Structures are given as structure tokens and as C-alpha cells.
Amino acid sequence: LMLEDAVTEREVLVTPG
């Protein structure tokens, strides 16, 4: 199998707070 990209272009390396 192969991994699959699981985030949008909007939220990438996002951090709350």
C-alpha cells in the first residue's frame, strides 16, 4: 500500500491557540 495525503491545502502545518 501507499500512504495518502490527509490534509487540505488550507490547513497544513496548522496549530491551534
Place this chain on the structure above:
Amino acid sequence: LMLEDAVTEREVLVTPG
């Protein structure tokens, strides 16, 4: 057995002529 020293002091590395 062991190798034996088999020449005199006179003729050592000698060459005639």
C-alpha cells in the same frame, strides 16, 4: 627441526675476482 648456521666468519657475502 630447526635450520642450522653452516658457514665460518671468513666467507660471508664473499665474491671471488
Place this chain on the structure above:
Amino acid sequence: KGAVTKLKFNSPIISTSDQLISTNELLDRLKALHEELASLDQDNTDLTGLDKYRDALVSRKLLKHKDVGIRAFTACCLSDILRLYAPDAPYTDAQLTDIFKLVLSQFEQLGDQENGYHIQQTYLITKLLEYRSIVLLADLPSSNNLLIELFHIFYDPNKSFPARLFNVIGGILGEVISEFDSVPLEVLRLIFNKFLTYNPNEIPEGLNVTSDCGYEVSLILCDTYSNRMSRHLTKYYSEIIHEATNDDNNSRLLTVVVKLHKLVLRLWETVPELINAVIGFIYHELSSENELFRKEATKLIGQILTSYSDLNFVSTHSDTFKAWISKIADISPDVRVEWTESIPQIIATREDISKELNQALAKTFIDSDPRVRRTSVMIFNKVPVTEIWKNITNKAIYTSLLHLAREKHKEVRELCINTMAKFYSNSLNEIERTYQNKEIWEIIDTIPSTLYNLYYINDLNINEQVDSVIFEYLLPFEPDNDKRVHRLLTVLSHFDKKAFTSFFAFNARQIKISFAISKYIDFSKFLNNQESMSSSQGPIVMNKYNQTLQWLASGLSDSTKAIDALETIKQFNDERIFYLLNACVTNDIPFLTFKNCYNELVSKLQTPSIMPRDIAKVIQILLFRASPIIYNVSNISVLLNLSNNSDAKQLDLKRRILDDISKVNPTLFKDQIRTLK
């Protein structure tokens, strides 16, 4: 019967009770007789008035006489008698054995310390070869034994034969064995083991003049007498294997075949023409039922292909080389790994092939077993970038390499990521572009984008890894102000929209991280002195810092390693480290000093609840996201318009970058132009 030359010696040689001959008189007489016989011409000589001595020189009283001289001279005389009478062969087989054991004795003493009759024995061996009388030894009922003995004599380690005779000894043993159809295994063990037991170039030293009789002899036999030895070499291989196989001990066979393979490997290096004699066995070994022997055969041919040889293996033995490359489809993965492990040296030693290799590695890179895939990518790691660029050219290899970077399997993926990045770096720092190699470059150039796309998978470990890798090989920290940018653009040159969005996001986070580490220290300094044990914010600021540290530790694979690390740093409460750390994150730092504070910072943490090594590998990766490296005084270099016109693919990047640098945080951006004005 009638001849012009004639034997002028007629003094007795046998001492009887009635008439006795002193040892010295006999010595002198035999000397005379020896000297005279030597001179005799074979065709023009009476030979009738010589039977007297023919009959006399076989008396056991002389053959086993005490004084070595008598024996040596007798030997020479008999050497000559054999030469003159031949091809009549005057002596009987018994007598002839008795003579030929004496000659062997003489050969034996020849390697011993001088008996004062070395010269006579030199004559003996030389003339026994010149006149080819030696081979008479072969037509005796005891010939095998005499052969073994003859061979043991010269291969004996305890003997020291002068080098001058080696060509002669190789002659003697050459002729005597050329008369044999089935040579005793013993002799062949003797001849062949010398390739195993004597390897030159093993000791680096001043002259290496030491030399070895048995080896040079083996070479002479395997070179000058190749045509007759090959036949035996075959028998040696088959018989040795046969011996080990039927052995009660069941674990020997492998051990012996692994040795035969070494013998082979040496022979290929020294006398490649002989390998033909056993190459079939190997060919069949490759297709053997037992995987281990296939593994070994593979390893062997693997070793062969990397060895210096006057001959060429793939040309000479294509049949089996094809069978060698056929092992990328062997049922046993061990065999595949064994094959794949050998390529780096091959590539590093020969350009003979870039066709079958490229054909094979393509399959090796998509094999079901992860071991081989790993062993495949390891190529890009073990063999220098240049040789990769030169030797391997198939499209599929690179694509598969980069493809595995998104693989489930971890151990492959990581190595992949690191490898193709270090490769990318090296693949720009060494190889230029022409009209023909650009064809594959569109893959090497999409490496950074691919790398940046991994972030989208959202894995802590991977994000950490890509973080680590990018700043290690891609965007280095050295060595100057201008080229970082020059390359930075080349890295940014081939991006998809995702790569840009992520590239920028990673940069958008940097300011928010800086705003965090700065307050982290501003909150960590709270333990410099008693500000509030429970006063101003004691009950509230502890749980702001304590909870704030989790924010930065939420992005790391091992948060429990992060929250522990910096709290111990608060335990430290040293100002220096705080100043360096704070200095690294404050934004707007000349690129050059950042390196100075960072390097000292990391170096300082080394060797002071668990090891700080962790804290280093945590704060480092943590810093890679925190500090400004790409958005900095680089601006000043991108600011200078490198080109009046042309190079649109550079200016659009200048734009793409600055355009954003002005948007993410302009506290730094609008000031330089002010300085410029």
C-alpha cells in the same frame, strides 16, 4: 655400434671384498664418469662399451650409499644413461623405480641446506627435464605414488628452493603430469590449495620479494599446462564436492563449496582461461534446488564481476552471466538480496553494463520483499552520485525511488526520504546539464516538491524527518549569503501549487512559533528569582507556561520527550542558553550569526530523567521550524535584481517569494527598501 666418439673412462665403481675402493677414490671416479657421460653425444657414440656401467650404476650399494656425493654423482650418471640409451629404456621397471626414488631423494635434498653437491642436483633436475627422461617415471606401476611424492617434495613448506629453478620445477611437474590421465586427488589438493593459502598483496611492506615456490609452480602448471590441467580441475571440483557430499558430517558441503568458489575466484583473477573447466557446475548451481548454493553461486559471480582480469566474463561466459542476472527473479529473497548487494561495487568497477543492470534494478525496485527494495535504494547511498548518473539511466529507477517515499513500510520510506534528498543535493553540486541528460532531470528536480508534499500526509515522524532532511541537504545552512538564495530558487524552481502552499505555510508557522519560544523564555525566566510563588500570577502563570509548552510539543512525535526536555531547561535556568535560544527565534537576524549561535547552542547541549541527546534532537528539529532561515537577509540578495532582462523563470520566483514575504510579516520587509532609499 660403431661411432666416432667413445667412452674413455674405464675405472671400477663397485667395491668388493677382493678389490676395495675408498670413498674418496669412488667419489672422484664417479665425478670423472659423470663429467664424461655428460659430454657424450647421443647419436654419435659407441654405447656398446658402456653397458659395463649401465649395469654397475644400479647396485643398491651405490643407490643407498652413505656419502651424499656418491649418490648425487650416481644420480647424474644415471640421468645421463637414461638419456643416451633412450628411447630403448635400458633399465627394468623395478630398477627404474629404484632410480627414480633416488632422484626424488636428490630433489628432496635440493631444497635442504647445501650438501656441497647442490650443483650436481641442479644438473640432475635440469638435464632430467631438458632430455625429458623424467617422464619415464610416469610409466611405472608405482607412478601414482611417485607422482604424489614428487609433488610433495616441491610443495613442501620446510624446503627452500631457489627462484631460478621454479621454471624448471614447473617443467618437471608439467611433463610428469602431462603423461597422467587420472591424477590422484592428493596432488590436485596440493596444486590448487596454494591459490587459497598464498594470497599476494596481503601484507603492505617494503619489497614483498619473499615469493613462494609452490604458488609460482601452480601458476606455471595452470598457465603453461592449462590444456591438460583444466580436465583435472573439473575432476577436482566434482570430486571435492562429491567427497564433502557423501561425508557423514552434514555441514561440510557448504563449507567446501564456499571454498571452491574462492579457488575459482582466485583462478579467474590469475588464470581466467581455466574457469571454463567448472563454469558449468556454477551455471547449474545457480539453478540448484537448494537455495543456499544458489545464494553462494550468485555471491561468487558477484565477486567475479568486480575483479581485475585480462579476460572479460560477460563476453566469455555470457551463458551464465545471463543466468546471474536471472536471479532477480529467484524464489528465495535471500538470493535476490545477495544479488542486489553486489551492484554498487560492480557499477563502481565496471561500465561494461548499463543495459541489463537498468533492466534488472527496475524490477528489483518494485519487488514484493522490502529487503531487496531497501538494498536497491542503498545503491544511491553507497556508490557515488556521479557513477549513478553515469551508469544507471532507466527512467523507472528514479520514479520508483521517489515513489517509495510514500510507502507504508517505514524502514524503506525513511531511508528513501534521506537518500533521495542527499542525492538531490549531491546531484546538483557535481553534475551539470547538457542536451541529453536533462531528459531524466525533470525527476531529480521534482524531488523538493515531492518532499514538501509529504507534509500533507500529516505524520509527526515524517514531518520531523522531512524537516530534518530539507535543512540538511536541500536548503543547507552554508556556506554564504548569495548561493543559498541562488539554489533556493532552483529548489523552488520546480514546484506544484501544493508545494508552494506548504512551503509558505511552513513559513507562516515560523512566526507563530517564534512568538511562542520567545514567550516560552519570557515565561521560563520566571524562575530566575522569586517573582510569585503564589503572588502576582503564581496560581495562573504556572498553568500558562505549563500548558503553553504543550502547544509546541503537540507537533512532535514524542511529546512526552518534549514537555520533559524544556522543563529541565527551566531546571537549568542558565541565561547563556536562553540568550542563544531567544536570539535564534527573535526574527530578523543576520544569517551568519544565527549559525554561530545555533551551532554553539547545539554543541553546548552535548555531553553535560534521561539523556540530553534527546533534548538536542528535539530542540534541533524544533528550531528548524522556529527560526528564520529562508525569510531573512536573503531578502537583500533577492532584492538585488540579478538580471536586467531574461530569466523570467527566476523573476517569477523573486515575485512568488517576496510577494509572500511582504504578506506574512512586513515588520522586516518594508525597512530594507527604506535603507535602500
Place this chain on the structure above:
Amino acid sequence: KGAVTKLKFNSPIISTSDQLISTNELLDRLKALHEELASLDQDNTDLTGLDKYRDALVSRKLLKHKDVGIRAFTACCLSDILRLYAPDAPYTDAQLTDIFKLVLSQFEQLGDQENGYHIQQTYLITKLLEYRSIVLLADLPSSNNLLIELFHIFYDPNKSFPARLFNVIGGILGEVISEFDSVPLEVLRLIFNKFLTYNPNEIPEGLNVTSDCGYEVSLILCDTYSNRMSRHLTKYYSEIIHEATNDDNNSRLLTVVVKLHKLVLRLWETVPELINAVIGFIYHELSSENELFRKEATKLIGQILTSYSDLNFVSTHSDTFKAWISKIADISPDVRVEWTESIPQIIATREDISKELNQALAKTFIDSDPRVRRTSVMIFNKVPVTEIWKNITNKAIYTSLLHLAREKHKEVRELCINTMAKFYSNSLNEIERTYQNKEIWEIIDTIPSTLYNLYYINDLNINEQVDSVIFEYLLPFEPDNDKRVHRLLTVLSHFDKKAFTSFFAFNARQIKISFAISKYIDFSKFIVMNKYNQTLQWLASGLSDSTKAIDALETIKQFNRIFYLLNACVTNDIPFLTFKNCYNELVSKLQTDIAKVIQILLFRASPIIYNVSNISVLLNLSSDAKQLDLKRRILDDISKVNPTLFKDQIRTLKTIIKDL
């Protein structure tokens, strides 16, 4: 029945035809139930108003429900139920298996990319360990299979479990296996092979951020559960061997044992306490009927003794270390060699032993097989001089070393000669003298005499070698005129009369050889023509392979710069400085066969010791008494080899002696 706390959740969880529950509603409800249950007290709780959900949470509609969420929350809930009802365990083994396949599923997803309920599954694994509910898995009729699966899950390379859980993952597998008596071999090959297939010193290359679940887990199991694992390790070794033996493939066993030995070698390095579990097998392997297994077993312990370890092998398992050193008397020479080969690295790595070694090498140095002897003398060649001087001190070693130089066996003789020479050289340029090593120096000091006495054997090869050896290690060409003599005297310091006679003869010969090679080109420049042949054959009479010399000089003469170099090297009376410069270039260019030929001739032909050294040998400070008496011994002869020099002073001295 009566408790202070009570379940306040009472919403249905099973969807029937009459009343339907939305998937999302079910998610929220199971979430609530999970949260509530999580906070419950294990002993202080009603537990009666819970059966309602105990019975519901085993329904296949929930266990094998489509939505992962439902399954995760169901898992957590069940994990709490098990904990609450504990230790009564109301469920049947069947239901419990059905639950535990679900938990295994959850663990499986725990290592996958986030599924949105990673938190619940982390909670699951954590609390399953904290409340130690996991071990229930072991008391089931399918426990073996579930164990194998459980282990395959985490050792799966396709899974990436976060590092924070590794200590927990090591816990789960720790407890669950601690309940097993006979663990399926599969699990043990699983756990142990990881030591072979993952070496933490192979993967460093940048930041070392890498880590791996299976390995750390294996260590945790082998460290924290050592007492429980060793017991199995024994079984693993024995079973692996048993399987390999009867494997029909007859060459399998060796390959397998050589691997087990590697497993061991790793375990000693990482968890030395475990080696106790198999040390007996090794002990018995050393004394095995089959030499090969002795060989492998021997080298293994050889490998052990050189690795850094928190523990110490000779102390811990002296029993076998003794059995290891007992291998200097093994019937099989291969074993002896195998033993002797390991020492150089050991000694350089450990000072722990200098008693048994010194005891053994004495025996190893007189072995009947020349191989072991060679590999013995190789010590002095491979390990640095200092470590020799410190570690080995036994008389017999050194005496045997120098003694073998006169042995019949050639391969020994040669290495011996070269080695003790390199040792002599290094043994003065690096090591100073003390009160007890002087006793060894008085043997190391007899090296030059012994070497020079070898010439008397009158063997061309030996003479060639000693020639080569002397000017490489004893009397080098380095570095400048000033010091060479100072040490030259030190090598000449300890000579017997023979050594002197030979030393002088070698130089009486030097002038006659020069007198020929000088004449050689002078003869080649062309009645003397049939003298050229005789001198040219004569010059090759001192060489082992004259037939290689006579060809060599024709190959150099075939040209008819180098000529000047030769003349320069042979003319006598040459500034020793330029000698080196012309000498080195000649060989360097002449090398890239013939090179090995002219050098030996030059060593005998050219002037090295009797040269511009003389003006330096003349100048003294008074001063060492041990040097001045020798300087005469030398010059006295230098005056005889060449009376062209001191003929003026001594004659005037003769006159003033007469007038007296």
C-alpha cells in the same frame, strides 16, 4: 449491589426496527457512555445498573459495526466494563475473544494514519494496561493465535506507532506474554530477529531522529521482563536448532547456528543478563563432536570479549571463558587458528586478562601446526607495540618469537623476520625503559645480532629478505644525516663478533658491487665485451632469481636520466641527501615488475651506512662511553674498506710512533 455512585447514562445503543438510532446519535451516545464509564470507581460502584449495557456491547451490530467510531467507543466502553466487573469476568470466553479481536483491530488502526479516533484507541491501549485487563486475552482457547496476531500487529513494519506509546506497547506485550508458558515460536522469532535486522549503529546519518517500535519493544521485553524472557530465549535457541537440524536441508544447521550466535552477540551487547539463558549451549558447543560448531562457538566468545558491555564476561561466565582459553588444545587446528585470530583485537580492547593469555600464547607459539604459529606471531604485527609491551610479558612469547626466525618452515620464518624487525624499530621509537621490562629489552636488544647472523645461512631468499628488512625498519634512509648515526650505533650497540664480521663483509662487498655496476654502464657504453657478459651474469649471482635480473638489466639497457641516477647511486662518496632523491624517483617511475629487482641490488650496491655519515661520526662531544668505543670499531673498518681517507694522519702518527 448498594453503592454511593450510580450509572447516570440510560439511552439505548441497539437499533431495532421499531426504534431507530442515527449513526451520529449512536456515536454521541457511545461517546457519552464511554466518558461516564471512564470516570467510574472500580470497587465503589453499584454495578447492577450496568448489566444493561454489558449485554448490549457484545452485539455484532456494534462489535463489527461499519463506522470505525462506533467500534472505537465500543472498545473503550468494553475496556472499562472488563475493569469494573473485574475480577469476576461475567462474559464467556467466546464473547471475550470476540471483544479481543475488536481490540486487536483497534490496535491495528492505532498504527495506521489517523482515523479520527486515535485518542479513543490510545485511551484503550493505555487503560487496558493500567487496569491490566489485557491479560484476559491469555486465558482463552484461542489465546495462542491472538498472541501471535497481537505481536504481529506491533512488529508490523507497515505500521507507524507514535513513540510516546512504545513504553506502553512494551507493557502490553510484556504482561500478555508473562501469562504464557509455551509461547508459539513465531512470536519469539518475531521478537528476537529484530536484534539481527535492526542495528542502531547502521542507521545514523544526520540527526538520528529515527526510531522503531519493534526494536525498543524487544528491548523492553528483554530488559523489563528479562526473568520472564530468558526462560523463552532458551526455548528459542533449542527449538531453532532442533528445527534447523531436521530441516532435511543438510547445510541449514550451520547457517542457523552462525545466526543464533549473532543473536547472542547482539544480546550480550544490549542485554548481557540474558546470555545466561543460553551460555550453557555455547559451553557445550565448544566441546561439540563437530569441529565447525566448535569453531563458530569459539569465535563467538571471541567476539563477545571485544564488545563494550555494562557487564564483564570473564567474571560473569568464567566457566566458559576458561573453556574458551581451553581451545588452544583442540584436536582441530582450524579451531586453534580461529581462537588465535581473535586476540589482537581483544588485547587492544582489554587489559582485563594478561594471565591466561600469557599462559596460552606460550603454548600457541609452539603448536605443531605452522598456521597457528603464524597467526600467533601476527599479534606483534597487528597490535600496537605499547599494548604488546604492557599486556604480554611472558619470557616464552618473545623467545619463541625470535626463535621461530630460524625454523625450517619458510612462511613462518619470513613473517617472523619481518615482524620482529618492525617490532624492534617501533619498540625503540615509542617505548621507554623501566626496571622489569628491561628484562624483555635484553631480548628485544638481540634482534639486530640475530638478524645479521642470518646471512650466514647463505640463502639467497633469506639474504634478500633481511636486506629488505634492515633498510626498511632497522637502518632507514630517514630523515636527515644528524640523527641516523645516533640510532645506527644503537642497533650496532648489541652485536656479537659474527654480526660485526658480517656487517663489515657486507660493506667490503659493497665497494666491489659498486665497482661492477659502475662498470656495467661503462661496459654497456660500447675485448671487454666478453667481460660485460661475465660481470653482468656475476651481478645476478647474489640474487635468488638471477634469470629475472639478467632480463631486467637488458630491459633497462634496451633504452641505451636513469643511467645518471644509477651512476649517482653507485659512484660512492655521494651526499646522502641526493641519494634518497635519485633513488626514490627511479623506483617510483620504474615500478609503473623490474622495480623489485634493482632495489635489492641497490641495497647491497649503493653506500648508505658508509657515506657522508662519516663526517658526522667523526664529530663527537667527547661523548657516551658506550658510543665512542664503537665509533672506532666502525671507522677502523671504514679505513680498511677505503684507505683513500685516513692514510695521511695515521702515517704521520706512525712516524711520531717511530721517533719515540
